[PDB]
Write an enzyme that holds these catalytic residues in place. Structure first.
Site, short mmCIF file in Angstrom:
data_model
loop_
_atom_site.label_atom_id
_atom_site.label_comp_id
_atom_site.label_asym_id
_atom_site.label_seq_id
_atom_site.Cartn_x
_atom_site.Cartn_y
_atom_site.Cartn_z
N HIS A 83 0.76 -1.20 -0.15
CA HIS A 83 -0.18 0.07 -0.05
C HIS A 83 0.89 1.05 -0.03
CE1 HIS A 83 0.47 -0.35 4.44
NE2 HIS A 83 0.11 0.81 4.48
N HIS A 85 1.65 3.81 2.12
CA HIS A 85 2.51 4.42 3.26
C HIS A 85 3.96 4.04 3.17
CE1 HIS A 85 -1.69 3.96 5.92
NE2 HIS A 85 -1.29 5.25 5.08
N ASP A 87 6.35 2.78 5.01
CA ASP A 87 6.92 1.53 5.48
C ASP A 87 6.75 0.56 4.38
OD1 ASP A 87 4.09 1.50 6.11
OD2 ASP A 87 4.39 -0.14 7.44
N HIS A 148 -6.45 -1.96 6.51
CA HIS A 148 -5.75 -1.20 6.82
C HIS A 148 -5.53 0.09 6.16
CE1 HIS A 148 -1.79 0.42 8.55
NE2 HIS A 148 -1.57 0.75 7.26
N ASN A 179 -1.82 1.70 13.46
CA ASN A 179 -1.98 3.11 13.04
C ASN A 179 -2.99 3.12 11.83
OD1 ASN A 179 -0.68 5.12 10.55
ND2 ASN A 179 -0.41 5.88 12.60
N1 LIG Z 1 -4.79 11.56 5.69
C1 LIG Z 1 -3.82 10.84 6.89
C2 LIG Z 1 -2.68 11.69 6.79
N2 LIG Z 1 -1.71 10.68 6.11
C3 LIG Z 1 -1.04 9.90 7.12
C4 LIG Z 1 -0.49 8.52 6.28
C5 LIG Z 1 0.14 7.62 7.10
C6 LIG Z 1 1.28 8.42 8.02
C7 LIG Z 1 1.90 7.49 9.11
C8 LIG Z 1 2.62 5.99 8.59
O1 LIG Z 1 3.53 6.56 7.81
N3 LIG Z 1 2.07 4.68 8.81
C9 LIG Z 1 2.84 3.69 8.40
C10 LIG Z 1 4.05 3.10 9.65
C11 LIG Z 1 3.21 2.57 10.89
C12 LIG Z 1 3.42 3.08 12.06
C13 LIG Z 1 2.93 2.36 13.16
C14 LIG Z 1 2.09 1.57 12.90
C15 LIG Z 1 1.73 0.75 11.67
C16 LIG Z 1 0.76 -0.16 11.29
O2 LIG Z 1 0.73 -0.73 10.24
O3 LIG Z 1 -0.03 -0.36 12.15
C17 LIG Z 1 2.48 1.68 10.71
O4 LIG Z 1 2.23 1.24 9.28
B1 LIG Z 1 1.77 2.40 8.14
O5 LIG Z 1 1.56 1.60 7.12
O6 LIG Z 1 0.40 2.73 8.72
C18 LIG Z 1 0.84 9.38 9.04
C19 LIG Z 1 0.27 10.38 7.75
ZN LIG Z 2 0.00 1.82 6.44
ZN LIG Z 3 2.11 -0.64 8.66
#
Ligand SMILES: NCCN[C@H]1CC[C@H](CC(=O)N[C@H]2Cc3cccc(C(=O)O)c3O[B-]2(O)O)CC1
Ligand SMILES: [Zn+2]
Ligand SMILES: [Zn+2]
Ligand SMILES: [Zn+2]
Length: 230
Positions: A83, A85, A87, A148, A179
Site C-alpha cells: 500500500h 504508506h 513503510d 488497513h 496506525n
Molecule cells: N490522511 C492521513 C494523513 N496521512 C497519514 C499517512 C500515514 C502516516 C503514518 C505512517 O506512515 N504509517 C505507517 C507506519 C506505521 C507506524 C505504526 C504502525 C503501523 C501499522 O501498520 O499499524 C504503521 O504502518 B503504516 O503503513 O500505517 C501518517 C500520515
Molecule cells: Zn499503512
Molecule cells: Zn504498517
C-alpha cells in the site's frame, strides 16, 4: 529464531529464510518516538528476485539491497509495494536507482501521489475490485477489500504456502489497533474473511509488523479490529 525489534538496530536489515527461495526481510524504524519492526518478502524467481515492500525509508532500503547481495547474491529485478504508506514505498527511489522495476496498483499510485510519498513506476492491473487475484511471477497478488488502507494488497507464495498480509494483518503481540487514520474499520473484518476464503491453505502468515504465525493471525486481527471498533 525470527528477528526481533530489540535485536535489530535502526539502519540495519536482517533476512529470515522461510523456505527454499522465500525470505522475509526485517527492519526497524522510529515512529512518534517508539521503535517498530517491519516486515517485507523476498521470493526467488529463477535467477532473480522479487521484492515485496521496501524496508521503510531510503537508508533501510539501501541496507536491504546490500544485505540481499551479501546473503543471496541474486539481482532484485522487480518490487511490489502493498500500500501507499512509507513503510511500503519509502525507499522506492533507492530501488529505482538500483534498476529495480517498481510496481503497485493504480489505487496505490494515486494515493501515494496525493500523500507526497514515493510513487512506484509500474501499474498492477486487474486488482481494483475486492476479491481480485493476479499472478505475478512466483506469487499471487490479492486485493481483499479495504482494511488497513483502501488499497492494501496481500501476497501469497503458492510454492511455500506463505501468506504475506502486510499491514492488514497484526501479529499476536499487538492487542490494540495500530496506525488507523487511513483505515476502513467497517470493512476490515469482511476483507480478512475474503483472505481466509481465498487462502485457506496458507501455513505461514506474515504480518506487516512483527512475528509470523499461522492462519490464527487473521482471527487475531479480526478480534483486535472489532474491539477497537467498539
Ligand atoms: N490522511 C492521513 C494523513 N496521512 C497519514 C499517512 C500515514 C502516516 C503514518 C505512517 O506512515 N504509517 C505507517 C507506519 C506505521 C507506524 C505504526 C504502525 C503501523 C501499522 O501498520 O499499524 C504503521 O504502518 B503504516 O503503513 O500505517 C501518517 C500520515
Ligand atoms: Zn499503512
Ligand atoms: Zn504498517
Ligand atoms: Zn520499468
Amino acid at each position: 529464531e525470527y528477528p526481533t525489534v530489540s535485536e535489530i538496530p535502526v539502519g540495519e536489515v536482517r533476512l529470515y529464510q522461510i523456505a527454499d527461495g522465500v525470505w522475509s526481510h526485517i527492519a526497524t524504524q522510529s515512529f512518534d518516538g517508539a521503535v517498530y519492526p517491519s516486515n517485507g518478502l523476498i521470493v526467488r524467481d529463477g535467477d532473480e528476485l522479487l521484492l515485496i515492500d521496501t524496508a521503510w525509508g531510503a537508508k533501510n532500503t539501501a541496507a536491504l539491497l546490500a544485505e540481499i547481495e551479501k546473503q543471496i547474491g541474486l539481482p532484485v529485478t522487480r518490487a511490489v509495494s502493498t500500500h501507499f504508506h512509507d513503510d511500503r514505498v519509502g525507499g522506492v527511489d533507492v530501488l529505482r536507482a538500483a534498476g529495480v522495476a517498481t510496481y503497485a496498483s493504480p489505487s496505490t499510485r494515486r494515493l501515494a501521489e496525493v500523500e507526497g510519498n514515493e510513487i512506484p513506476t509500474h501499474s498492477l492491473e486487474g486488482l481494483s475490485s475486492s476479491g481480485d487475484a493476479v499472478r505475478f511471477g512466483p506469487v499471487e497478488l490479492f486485493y481483499p477489500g479495504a482494511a488497513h488502507s483502501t488499497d492494501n494488497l496481500v501476497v501469497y507464495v503458492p510454492s511455500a504456502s506463505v501468506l504475506y498480509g502486510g499491514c492488514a494483518i497484526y501479529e499476536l503481540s499487538r492487542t490494540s489497533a495500530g496506525n488507523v487514520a487511513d483505515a476502513d474499520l467497517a470493512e476490515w473484518p469482511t476483507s480478512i474473511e475474503r483472505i481466509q476464503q481465498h487462502y485457506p491453505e496458507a501455513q505461514f502468515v506474515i504480518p506487516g509488523h512483527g512475528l509470523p504465525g499461522g492462519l490464527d493471525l487473521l482471527k487475531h486481527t479480526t478480534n483486535v479490529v472489532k474491539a477497537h471498533t467498539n
